């Protein structure tokens, strides 16, 4: 009485059901409008998928662009946190602190038996790439999901400097992956999605807090503008934030 008769919203024919089965044998009634939902309607940010072994081991070293002081990302993230809390007292123990803020442009499983020597050659490959580059301006706009909703992050948009930055980071991915046979997560040839994780469900909270952050808590900001900011430093850091807040600065490069 207010639309089509047999809408194409519900026009669906699933073919993992055998033939004839829905004809004369059996009914398969389900809800298909959630398995046919788009990454734009959920938040699946197709993160570089690490294979078996590199998935078994935890991130040891990680390349990250450092945020400067007196940001816009920091302040808009601060108001996002105020509203996370005024929305729910539940969700404070899931948010990442403001000081742990960084920009993740790659994680890497490094062995300690060849630790500092490999870190040095990696530093060569990083500085030999980011030497001629100018300081980088990026765009933060709209969040997404890592770990199937486990991680909420303010992706940097590909709309200002992702081209240059990804030539750089796929170069250093190729170098750390095929040149010096270090374990970056994915293929030596893949391009790791640079990301700004703003909250996360960690294995130490999976049990109580879940395996999927509640899309109601943050979804008002899933497509919010978080700001365009400039940055000058690509740092390889070892995964220990408790040093002085920001993770152990195992190497820096100024731009």
């Amino acid at each position: 009485e207010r639309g089509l008769y047999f809408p194409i919203n519900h026009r669906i024919v699933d073919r993992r059901i055998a033939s004839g089965v829905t004809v004369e044998e059996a009914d398969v009634q389900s809800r298909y409008r959630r398995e046919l939902r788009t990454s734009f309607a959920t938040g699946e940010t197709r993160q570089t998928i690490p294979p078996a072994w590199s998935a078994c081991e935890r991130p040891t070293h990680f390349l990250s662009l450092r945020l400067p002081v007196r940001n816009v990302l920091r302040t808009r993230v601060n108001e996002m946190h105020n509203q996370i809390l005024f929305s729910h007292q539940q969700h404070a123990p899931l948010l990442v602190p403001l000081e742990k803020l960084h920009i993740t442009l790659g994680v890497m499983a490094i062995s300690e038996r060849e630790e500092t020597e490999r870190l040095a050659s990696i530093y060569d490959c990083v500085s030999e790439v980011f030497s001629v580059i100018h300081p980088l301006q990026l765009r933060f706009r709209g969040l997404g999901t890592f770990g199937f909703g486990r991680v909420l992050f303010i992706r940097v948009v590909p709309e200002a400097d992702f081209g240059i930055l990804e030539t750089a980071v796929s170069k250093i991915r190729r170098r750390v992956g095929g040149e010096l046979k270090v374990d970056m997560k994915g293929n030596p040839h893949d391009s790791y999605v640079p990301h700004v994780t703003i909250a996360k469900i960690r294995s130490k909270q999976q049990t109580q807090f879940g395996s999927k952050i509640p899309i109601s808590m943050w979804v008002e900001y899933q497509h919010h503008d978080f700001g365009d900011v400039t940055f000058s430093q690509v740092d390889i850091c070892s995964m220990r934030g408790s040093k002085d807040g920001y993770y152990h600065t195992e190497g820096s490069v100024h731009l």
């Binding site: 055998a18 033939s19 089965v21 004369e24 044998e25 293929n187």
Partner: protein, 203 residues
């Protein structure tokens, strides 16, 4: 059906101005082997060849079985000379199933707008996917059917050659991760609740 209906349907796929994938070759070679139309499983080779196509490891193994059964070493020596030579066993350091590599053939705007209409045409030529259909290294199979046909035709010497070379690599090199099943040749089962079925004592 006569056996030849695959063959006819392969050709009629050609006359249809179609690009017979390697799966349309594996299938069409199995179904004439089953039927014992081996001169036909050969002319499927020759159709694959007149097409100037690159028989992936699977397809070389296929035609090599055909040479085995027909008992002609010559038939197989050329597949060896032509295609399954740059096939090398998995050396201890290198990755076993090197991933699929070729991206989905795409274009940018200045690629699509300026380039001629005949360069963009993508009717899936089967020689665009050998880089991944040989990503799974059936080399031991290949060498094995090589040794087989060598024995069949009666070349003790070359037979020893293939067998020995294969065995040493077996002893020395790791094992290539075998292929996940051909998602199109051998068919997935569909989930069918067998309730409304003629039971064991139905009649």
């Amino acid at each position: 059906t006569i056996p030849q209906e695959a063959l006819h349907w392969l050709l009629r796929m050609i006359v249809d101005n179609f690009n017979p994938q390697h799966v349309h070759y594996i299938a069409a070679m199995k179904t004439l082997q089953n039927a014992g139309e081996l001169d036909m499983a050969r002319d499927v080779w020759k159709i694959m060849e007149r097409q100037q196509t690159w028989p992936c490891t699977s397809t070389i193994c296929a035609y090599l079985d055909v040479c085995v059964e027909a008992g002609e070493k010559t038939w197989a020596m050329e597949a060896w000379n032509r295609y399954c030579t740059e096939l090398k066993f998995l050396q201890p350091g290198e990755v076993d199933p090197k991933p699929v590599s070729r991206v989905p053939f795409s274009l940018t705007r200045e690629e699509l707008l300026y380039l001629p209409k005949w360069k963009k045409h993508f009717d899936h030529d089967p020689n665009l996917d050998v880089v991944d259909l040989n990503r799974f290294n059936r080399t031991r199979e290949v060498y094995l059917r090589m040794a087989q046909v060598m024995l069949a035709g009666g070349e003790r010497d070359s037979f020893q050659h293939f067998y020995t070379k294969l065995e040493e690599a077996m002893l020395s090199t790791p094992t290539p991760v075998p292929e996940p099943p051909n998602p199109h040749l051998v068919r997935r089962p569909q989930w069918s609740p067998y309730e409304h079925c003629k039971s064991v004592h139905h009649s």
